[PDB]
Structure 1
């Protein structure tokens, strides 16, 4: 079994001529030649079996990605693993090879307004499908948006995704949260568990702002600092928006702050298309109930060159968290059986 950059990458004999790409937490990504389809693919090695949390995210990702089928969501082409649970120590997920991701692209490339518009359209088109399945991605950010050489965009990494649960979204002030800090909606720090679709629209708004300037709009350095970056741009919430926050600790925190004025988007982004900034404002709205929804965003004048709801498909049907890692390995084994 051939090796890569230290350890075993046991994918053969269908996949050959491996090249290292990157790493994450418990596994590395390589590119490889698919000897059957005769194209290079991406292969991600996943070693999650010692931890409930890793098994949980792996199962979530596999289950969701196998059920979804959409041009703007990464597919699972194949899954390689041992024939028996006993022998299964790793799982390899084979996906389309994508040249880059939006994080890498934004580090070095200025985006034309035409690219920004196209990228945003594709993000929202994929998100419409995810939300139509009653799923929340919950970790949208540039590094989870893959791009190929012709700039087709695919959303990836569903390891933090959940089924939407708006009736149980409420929580207290300063409740711990897992998803990436800079893309967190203000309500996460105030009174929300991130169980409603508006959590993802906020993240997309952050991504749009970052495409406009190649810099994160709200780069907080720690949990509450994230909220002060948001408020430093949006300004103080209105009385109406405060009244929607019944939790007294969260409301009184906001009332304790000195008044802050809104920074006009066109001062922050003086070269941006005015229609893009109108949509940005609607995505980055403080009150999550007033925030634009995915289907409204697709219909926004900024996206008129691409909008076509008949070509923006939805899921054919909509889609726990306290299971021992043992049942989870069995579940991963079962979920991946179709590829044997």
Structure 2
């Protein structure tokens, strides 16, 4: 009765702050009008004025908008609306109440192989679909991996960088960045299987494979590449990681003509029914405690909101 919806900032109620950064804020919000009223979303708010200052920032912002519209997949975060005002860009994504999956590592100290297995497979599906659509993830990290309500993986940062720091690859943690990214010898589709390697390692030992005393030193360690394999590891987890964490790109598992399927065919995934896995029919090893703000804080509080970009405006179907 009266139109379709023109989604506006005033359709949402600002409930908590989930993330602050140089380029904008992530809020937790409730839709209060029309359509799903009462449903909870995450609302990423970006500052137009500062993005258009820099072309590399304009790219990711536009790409994120693109990818989230065009690349939908069960282990990738859903975009539900997008819209803009003068001076601001808004993105309303699904609210991921499970929180970060490396916070589960804080509590588990470390992840059981069979438990890491589930998370790694789902991750791989996402990465593999991401490739089928010609997208390379660059800087995958444990922060980029989140957990929906029932506790399944969802990939997360496709736009700008959360940092407020800005010192684009050296702003936050580099421990999960392939040598080539550091040697600026490009990237490639096999850069993401490195990152999967680093994540596995962390998932089992609680640390990235090579760390140093400081940046310079870190970068070094990584390039040096000497790999330390805790004893308590089963042969196949050993097997898998050797292959993945390979100095040279060409040589990593997942690099081949068909590659995320081959990664998946590895004996470490022998128990994984991809059919039901992607149907989200396997119960996840972790099911956390809808609005529950618990796993983001305590750091974040105080809710309040501070040419190109044509077609940014968007409503998801379904």
- How does the TM-score come out when normalised to structure 1? 0.69
Match of 2:266 in 1: 300
Identify the structure with bigger relative contact order (alpha carbons < 8 Å, sequence gap 6+). Answer: 2
Question: CA separation in 1, counterparts of 2:64 and 2:224?
Answer: 33
Please, which of 18, 23, 28 is the counterpart of residue 21 of structure 1? 18
Match of 2:138 in 1: 138
Relative distance call for 1:48 and 1:146 in structure 2 (3 A) is farther
The structure whose Rg is larger is 1
Match of 2:88 in 1: 90
Q: Alpha-carbon deviation of 1:120?
A: 0.2
Q: Alpha-carbon deviation of 1:308?
A: 3.2
Question: CA separation in 2, counterparts of 1:309 and 1:187?
Answer: 34
State the Cα deviation string for residues 146-168 of structure 1 (Å, max 9, x = none).
1124221111212379xxxxxxx
Question: CA separation in 1, counterparts of 2:224 and 2:158?
Answer: 29
Alignment of 1:1-340 (within 5 A): 11-13=9-11, 15-35=12-32, 36-37=35-36, 38-50=38-50, 51-52=53-54, 53-82=56-85, 88-98=86-96, 99-110=98-109, 111-159=111-159, 178=169, 180-190=173-183, 192-194=185-187, 196-220=188-212, 221-223=214-216, 225-234=218-227, 263=228, 265=229, 269-293=230-254, 294-308=260-274, 330=308, 332-337=309-314
Match of 2:297 in 1: none
SS at 2:19 equivalent = strand
RMSD (Å), alpha carbons: 2.8
Relative distance call for 1:100 and 1:310 in structure 2 (3 A) is closer
Question: CA separation in 2, counterparts of 1:123 and 1:19?
Answer: 28
Cα pair 2:81 2:93 within 8 Å, conserved: yes
Cα pair 2:61 2:159 within 8 Å, conserved: yes
Cα pair 1:198 1:288 within 8 Å, conserved: yes
**Whose helix proportion is higher, 1 or 2?**
1
Deviates more, 1:129-138 or 1:181-190: 181-190
Q: Alpha-carbon deviation of 1:232?
A: 5.0
Deviates more, 1:140-149 or 1:118-127: 140-149
Cα pair 1:45 1:91 within 8 Å, conserved: yes
Question: CA separation in 2, counterparts of 1:22 and 1:191?
Answer: 30
State the Cα deviation string for residues 48-102 of structure 1 (Å, max 9, x = none).
43322332221111111111010011121111322xxxxx211121111113112
What residue ranges of structure 2 are gaps of 5+ in the alignment? 1-7, 162-167, 255-259, 280-306
- How does the TM-score come out when normalised to structure 2? 0.73
SS at 2:27 equivalent = strand
